[PDB]
Amino acid sequence: STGFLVKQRAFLKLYMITMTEQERLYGLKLLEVLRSEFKEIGFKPNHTEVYRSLHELLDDGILKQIKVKKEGAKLQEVVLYQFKDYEAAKLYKKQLKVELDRSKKLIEKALSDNF
Amino acid sequence: STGFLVKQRAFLKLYMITMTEQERLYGLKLLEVLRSEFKEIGFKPNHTEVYRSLHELLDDGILKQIKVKKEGAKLQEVVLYQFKDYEAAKLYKKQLKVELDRSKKLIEKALSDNF
DNA sequence: CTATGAACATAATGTTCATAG
DNA sequence: CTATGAACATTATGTTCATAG
């Protein structure tokens, strides 16, 4: 790694953690929320990148899955997430904060040097 | 393309254009100047990415090569660059300015929503 | 039809290797 | 040697395919 901008998977993983802190949404739901938030800026993530993020967090041991099966009128069989190790999540958030700041700097320097 | 952050090749191509506007440096020279400018932020591009940028610009028809042989105490078979179509270069700079602003926005939004 | 998640493709990169002269 | 640039490997990311409902 030459140390360029932050990767999308990491950027999304950051958002998966924050959303596990504030809500209980499943994959396609996270994807829908995310697309809506970024529709204006132009970023349109797909479902496989969101799943990759969520699953990477499972492997990192930060999240744990909760299989849910809501029965009745509108059958849903989704997967919800919660923290398995919030401390490791906090640490991931801090690392990502450093990655995001460098990134902001890299873009500022470029805006400054070419325009 | 899901429209995430700006790619490195584009980011470097932007810098090749600006540097063709302000100086006459050859590949390894551009690379040395670039590494020095970004040593602090932590970005360390390599010589093959710089060549890819320069060559992409040749294909886009924005630059043209000038083979230079620096004779004397230390012969050098170097390549210098100049504009072949500065108008197309200006347009590439503008497109990239839009890409860079979106990028800055994407990172700001992320810093704002998770911290 | 939804939702999950795998598979596979392609693109972006990063590391090595080739070569003129 | 040494500045350019081609090859090759590996990542990161976008599209399809497979299952279960």
Swiss-Prot record, chains A, B:
Q: Which GO terms describe its biological process?
A: DNA replication termination
Q: Cite the SUPFAM superfamilies for this sequence.
A: Winged helix' DNA-binding domain
Q: Which domain of life is it from?
A: Bacteria
Listed GO molecular functions?
DNA binding
InterPro entries, per database record: RTP (IPR003432), WH-like_DNA-bd_sf (IPR036388), WH_DNA-bd_sf (IPR036390)
**Which keywords does this Swiss-Prot/TrEMBL entry list?**
DNA-binding
The keyword DNA-binding is annotated on this UniProt entry: yes
Keyword DNA-binding listed? The answer is yes
Which Pfam family is one of this chain's hits? Answer: RTP
Quaternary assembly: Homodimer.
> What is the role of the protein in this entry?
Plays a role in DNA replication and termination (fork arrest mechanism). Two dimers of rtp bind to the two inverted repeat regions (IRI and IRII) present in the termination site. The binding of each dimer is centered on an 8 bp direct repeat.
- The name on file for this protein is Replication termination protein
Organism expressing this protein natively: Bacillus spizizenii (strain ATCC 23059 / NRRL B-14472 / W23)
Gene that specifies this protein: rtp
